Amino acid sequence: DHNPFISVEWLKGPILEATAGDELVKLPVKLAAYPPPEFQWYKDGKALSGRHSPHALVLKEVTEASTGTYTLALWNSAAGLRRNISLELVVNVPPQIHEKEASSPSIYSRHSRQALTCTAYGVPLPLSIQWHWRPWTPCKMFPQCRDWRAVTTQDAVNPIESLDTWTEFVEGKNKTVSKLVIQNANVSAMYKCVVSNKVGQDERLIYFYVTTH
Amino acid sequence: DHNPFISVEWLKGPILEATAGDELVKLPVKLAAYPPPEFQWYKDGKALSGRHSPHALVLKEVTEASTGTYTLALWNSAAGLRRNISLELVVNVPPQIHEKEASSPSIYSRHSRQALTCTAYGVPLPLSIQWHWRPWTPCKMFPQCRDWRAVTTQDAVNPIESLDTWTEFVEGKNKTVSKLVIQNANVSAMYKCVVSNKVGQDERLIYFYVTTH
Ligand SMILES: *[C@@H]1O[C@H](CO)[C@@H](O)[C@H](O)[C@H]1NC(C)=O
Ligand SMILES: *[C@@H]1O[C@H](CO)[C@@H](O)[C@H](O)[C@H]1NC(C)=O
Ligand SMILES: *[C@@H]1O[C@H](CO)[C@@H](O)[C@H](O)[C@H]1NC(C)=O
Ligand SMILES: *[C@@H]1O[C@H](CO)[C@@H](O)[C@H](O)[C@H]1NC(C)=O
């Protein structure tokens, strides 16, 4: 009937996921309109600079800061037509264990009590941290060894005083924290804490070298 | 005499410094040539994409990965002229104390021995870490309090067993590590470690809360 229109919808939407570090991430819409409408992309309320397409907003490289609400505004003034569509960007982050970045003791005093701590952040937040152990022996089958055993009360290489996992607020972020407390440092061993979400995994190796003073 | 030439030199050079996070960093040269020469920018041997000026290469945003050797190659084939000039980019990094990112004990057992550790990386690497202390009292004069005292053997709030600083290889980086060992956790106090280079400073606060069990 020759009448102007603006139709816009998600390809699937309203939520789109990308992993931190992904380049050229498209935020697309299904847009059919006549005549070609005026438009403007926004993020969390504020306009966006540069030449864009009304069919897809392209993010050069996503970080955790790229997370937010992206809005396409379309209008045909002469026709009195207006359409707003919003896309929720979720940027997932592969988990990191922070103690890895910090110095760690090379020697542990025999018979002593020792606490081993792993702090992990990621998006989504990993809700558990798994502890594993292996003997103080070389590896035959090699980041991998084949003799790693889960840490339990049954057949522990060193007696376990405790093993707790919780959520803690650290540097403006909610973080998962696990602490394995060894009641007595009897024998050298290797421990590791492993953490995972849907977009990645991380491991911290602890060389639990034990000597007498 | 109408003869073609290519002359290129550093504005000051050969070394240019920028801080990690700086945007639109110019790597400029003093270039006088006739006729307009052909040219190509490289980084550490590999060519660079995009439209550039032979007068200055513009880096959109610098990171520690932006560090390297940037080379302008100029040539006038018909004249048989060739000129290569290299600029050394150094990207400084404000220091970070990694233990800040990780969980930290809220309570310390009275009379016990406790080690406090700060691990710092930065560009340039900070060569020292300063330890300070203040009483377990509220602050009148407030990230700042006015009663912080340097940590020494004279008038220590808790007896100091040791205080060592060294360099350690951690996660593929050389890092400065300082460990303050408190011989006896007699009294609650606040400690902090402070670290600095020419482009920044960082602090980690430790709430040394002491109780009897
Ligand atoms: C579309 O978004 C803009 C910017 O937030 C807002 O001012 C306007 O009211 C919206 N228009 C419609 C059609 O909802
Ligand atoms: C962390 O967890 C608390 C408790 O559930 C929650 O209320 C808060 O929104 C979270 N904080 C952040 C910054 O994610
Ligand atoms: C300039 O740099 C290029 C690329 O590294 C190299 O192949 C060429 O030999 C250099 N030319 C001159 C004039 O040194
Ligand atoms: C760290 O320090 C060592 C000892 O001086 C030095 O040889 C090495 O180049 C440094 N390593 C790195 C990766 O900076």
UniProtKB/Swiss-Prot annotation, chains A, B:
Mod. after translation: Autophosphorylated on tyrosine residues upon ligand binding. Autophosphorylation occurs in trans, i.e. one subunit of the dimeric receptor phosphorylates tyrosine residues on the other subunit. Phosphorylation in response to H(2)O(2) is mediated by a process that requires SRC and PRKCD activity.
Subcellular location: Cell membrane; Cytoplasm; Nucleus
Effect after changing residue 119 to E: Decreases autophosphorylation on tyrosine residues upon ligand binding. Abolishes autophosphorylation on tyrosine residues upon ligand binding
Residue ranges of every copy of the Ig-like C2-type domain listed in the record: 4-88, 95-211
Tissue note: Detected in endothelial cells (at protein level). Widely expressed. Detected in fetal spleen, lung and brain. Detected in adult liver, muscle, thymus, placenta, lung, testis, ovary, prostate, heart, and kidney.
Residues with attached carbohydrate: 84, 174, 186
Cysteine disulfide links: 118-193, 139-145
Domain of life: Eukaryota
Disease: Lymphatic malformation 1: A form of primary lymphedema, a disease characterized by swelling of body parts due to developmental anomalies and functional defects of the lymphatic system. Patients with lymphedema may suffer from recurrent local infections. LMPHM1 is an autosomal dominant form with variable expression and severity. Onset is usually at birth or in early childhood but can occur later. Affected individuals manifest lymphedema, predominantly in the lower limbs, and hypoplasia of lymphatic vessels. Additional features are hemangioma and nail dysplasia or papillomatosis. Hemangioma, capillary infantile: A condition characterized by dull red, firm, dome-shaped hemangiomas, sharply demarcated from surrounding skin, usually presenting at birth or occurring within the first two or three months of life. They result from highly proliferative, localized growth of capillary endothelium and generally undergo regression and involution without scarring.
Assembly and oligomerization: Interacts with VEGFC and VEGFD. Monomer in the absence of bound VEGFC or VEGFD. Homodimer in the presence of bound VEGFC or VEGFD. Can also form a heterodimer with KDR. Interacts with PTPN14; the interaction is enhanced by stimulation with VEGFC. Interacts with CRK, GRB2, PTK2/FAK1, SHC1, PIK3R1 and PTPN11/SHP-2. Identified in a complex with SRC and ITGB1.
Protein family: Belongs to the protein kinase superfamily. Tyr protein kinase family. CSF-1/PDGF receptor subfamily.
Function: Tyrosine-protein kinase that acts as a cell-surface receptor for VEGFC and VEGFD, and plays an essential role in adult lymphangiogenesis and in the development of the vascular network and the cardiovascular system during embryonic development. Promotes proliferation, survival and migration of endothelial cells, and regulates angiogenic sprouting. Signaling by activated FLT4 leads to enhanced production of VEGFC, and to a lesser degree VEGFA, thereby creating a positive feedback loop that enhances FLT4 signaling. Modulates KDR signaling by forming heterodimers.
Entry remark concerning the domains of this protein: The first and second Ig-like C2-type (immunoglobulin-like) domains are sufficient for VEGFC binding. The fourth and fifth Ig-like C2-type domains are sufficient for homodimerization. The fifth and seventh Ig-like C2-type domains are required for autophosphorylation and further activation.
Protein name (Swiss-Prot/TrEMBL): Vascular endothelial growth factor receptor 3
Source species: Homo sapiens (Human)
Gene: FLT4
Residues of the full protein shown: 330 to 553 of 1363
